[PDB]
Each structure stands twice: as structure tokens, then as C-alpha cells.
Amino acid sequence: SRTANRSGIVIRRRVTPAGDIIVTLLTPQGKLKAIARGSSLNLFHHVGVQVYQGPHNDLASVKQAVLEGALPTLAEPERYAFAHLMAEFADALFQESEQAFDLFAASLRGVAHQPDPEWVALVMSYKLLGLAGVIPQTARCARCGAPDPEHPDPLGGQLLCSKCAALPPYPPAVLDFLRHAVRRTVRASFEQPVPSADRPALWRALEKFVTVQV
């Protein structure tokens, strides 16, 4: 049959003034973008639904949408910006393995509940990138190849050596994380947070890294 029902999370939501709602889901079977005309189908819901596919309509229709679970807390300003981020990743990576789904899932869970939301977002950010096969390159300078570069790289979003570097070195906390960054477990990588004072460097870092890859 051409009619299938699946389990998902809404990582994107949109409307056209007709009252029709286009939506992007993340399912363990990959990402899937389905349309329905008319769970009320809300952003960040854990939902499940029947959707109809075919040549008749090349963007999948939607018949019955039913809510499994949900995370209200994500609206409060903090956890909010951070969610929208995580889902923007889920959308940019994971191109429609279930692993990514269980991860990003976990991300929303922890960005909702866990008391330090920005930390959740950093960690899960680099794990989401990583599982998706984008690894910050650390050991070798980006330009000359010198071991253990400690400086920001504006152009490539990688790390340059003091000799091949315009800006000062990322603080030791940010470096230690950056290096040992993708190896540690969520469990024990939450236990070793970058001091608040040094995160902004680490943010500005991640931003260009992503900008340049993704």
C-alpha cells in the first residue's frame, strides 16, 4: 500500500494563509516532510501519525495525527532558543540512522529538564554534529600542521597555531573540551562543563565551525 503510519518529533512547522500546515518530522526512519490541510501537530511534540504517499501528490499528505509525549518547558525563553537550535541541527544533518533520532530526542529532553540548558546545548550540539560525521579537527593546525593548535581560526572554523594565528588562544577550559570534546560520554561530559566566563569563546568558536561546514 501507499499509506503508512510512523512515529516522530516535529522539528519544523510552517503555514500558508489557506490554513494548510506543512511540517518536517524526525523519525527513526529518517527525516520526513509531510503536509496536512487544516497532537494539534505542534513544534517539538513527540507525535505519531498516518500519512499518504504517491505520484498523486509529491509532498506526503496527512490523515490522522496522534500525540505521544510533549515538553512544555521548552517555551520558556532559555530552553527555547536552545531547542530551536537543536532542531535546526536535526534538520541540517540526518538527511531523511535511528541513532541520530534517539540523540536529538535526548537533546530536547535534557534541554527541557536539566538545570544548565546552555551546557546541554553545547555538548549535544557537538554530539549531534559528530554522529553526523562532522568532527572538529584539533590535533593538527589547519594551515601549517603544527600539533596542538590553541588559537581560533576565522576562515575554516578549525584551530591555528600561535604562529599562524591572528587572535589569542581559546582559554584552557575551552581547549580541553574542544580536544577531548567528541570522545567523552554525555554522562561524563556533563560533569565537566566550561566555566560560564569561557563559554562565549567556545560559542563564537562553534558558530564559525558550523557556518563553514554546514
Binding site: 519544523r12 512547522r13 510552517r14 500558508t16 494563509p17 489557506a18 490554513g19 494548510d20 497532537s39 494539534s40 505542534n42 513544534l43 517539538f44 500525540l67 510533549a70 512544555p72 521548552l74 517555551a75 520558556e76 525563553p77 527555547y80 532558543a81 530551536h84 537550535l85 532542531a87 535546526e88 534538520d91
Partner: protein
């Protein structure tokens, strides 16, 4: 040309566009003319309102300029329709302010395009502001942010009640709404 320009508008599919273009060919020069006429009169003659951004023609909407309405309270809604359907209920004589969207980071919407900033002037010592943005996480968040931003100024922040809608049974109401109308529950008899 006509027909694709129909498929343009929302609510119009390809054969809906067909149907409309064709049915349109059988109108007079009169109909079609005055149709485009009203179209462009709507383009130019009316515009956004700077106080609260409900659509009008003159320098102020009839909610603002009309003095019979009280200044104690302003009600923030997602868009103009919201303004209308809200007046309809016949429960509100105050002010609406229209933030012309909600807050979405993904979609790219910051509280800039949003009419937030021009709201702050309107809220003065000891008033009430009601948050009429929708109940979608996006509207929710929008509200939340609007409150935690609005609390410094002396006015009173309230937000339209979440719960089960008039004339509906729980059996067929969703788990989220149920839960929130279970917590939000008002009290009647106290000892």
C-alpha cells in the same frame, strides 16, 4: 498568466485556479475591472497603524482613536484576524496591540520584525497587559518572553486561560490540554 497568478494565492490549487480563471472569463469588463479596482484601493489607500499595528486607512484604527474604549489595558494578539475574532466574543472593550508574527528562531523571526519594541512605550505605570498570542509553542514562548520583558514596567501581566474549550468532553480532548486545564483549574468552594 491569470491562472498561475491564481495558483499563487493560498487556498488555490491548480484546478481550483483553472475553475476560477475560467469562471472569471465569463464576468463582464465591469466585474473584473472593479475587482482589480478594489484590489489596488486595498493596496494603497490603507496601511499599517503605528500605535498598535492593526490595519486601517486613516491615521488611527477605530480601536485607538475612538475615545469610548478604556486605556487601562492592552491586549497583544498574533495578527489582525486575532483582533477581529477577539472583538467578536464581546468580552473586551480595551486595547489590542498587534505583533505581526510570533517568535521563531528556526524560521528566522526575531522580536525586531515583531512589533514588540513599539509596544513598550504604550505600557505605563499600573496598567494591565493581556497576552493574546496563540497557544502554539511559538505563541506560548512569545508570550513568556513578553512577560519576562514586560514585568519591569508597573503594569499587570495576565495571559488568556489554557483549558478545554466550551462544549467538549475530556474523553476526546488531548493529554496536553487536559493536563493544563487540570493544573490551571479554578477553585469554587473553599472551607
Amino acid at each position: 498568466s491569470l491562472i498561475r497568478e491564481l495558483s499563487r494565492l493560498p487556498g488555490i490549487g491548480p484546478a481550483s485556479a483553472q475553475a476560477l480563471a475560467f469562471h472569471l472569463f465569463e464576468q463582464p469588463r465591469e466585474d473584473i475591472e472593479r475587482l482589480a479596482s478594489a484590489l489596488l484601493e486595498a493596496k494603497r489607500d490603507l496601511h499599517v497603524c503605528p500605535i498598535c499595528f492593526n490595519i486601517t486607512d486613516a491615521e488611527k484604527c477605530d480601536v485607538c482613536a475612538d475615545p469610548s474604549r478604556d486605556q487601562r489595558t492592552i491586549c497583544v494578539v498574533e495578527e489582525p484576524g486575532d483582533v477581529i475574532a477577539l472583538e467578536r466574543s464581546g468580552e473586551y472593550r480595551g486595547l489590542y496591540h498587534v505583533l505581526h508574527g510570533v517568535l521563531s528562531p528556526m524560521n528566522g523571526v526575531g522580536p525586531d520584525k515583531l512589533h514588540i519594541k513599539p509596544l513598550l512605550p504604550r505600557v505605563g505605570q499600573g496598567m494591565e497587559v493581556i497576552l493574546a498570542t496563540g497557544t502554539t509553542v511559538e505563541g506560548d514562548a512569545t508570550a513568556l518572553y513578553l512577560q519576562r520583558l514586560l514585568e519591569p514596567l508597573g503594569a499587570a501581566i495576565s495571559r488568556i486561560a489554557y483549558g478545554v474549550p466550551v462544549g467538549g468532553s475530556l474523553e476526546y480532548t488531548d493529554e496536553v490540554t487536559l493536563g493544563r486545564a487540570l493544573t490551571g483549574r479554578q477553585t469554587v468552594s473553599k472551607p
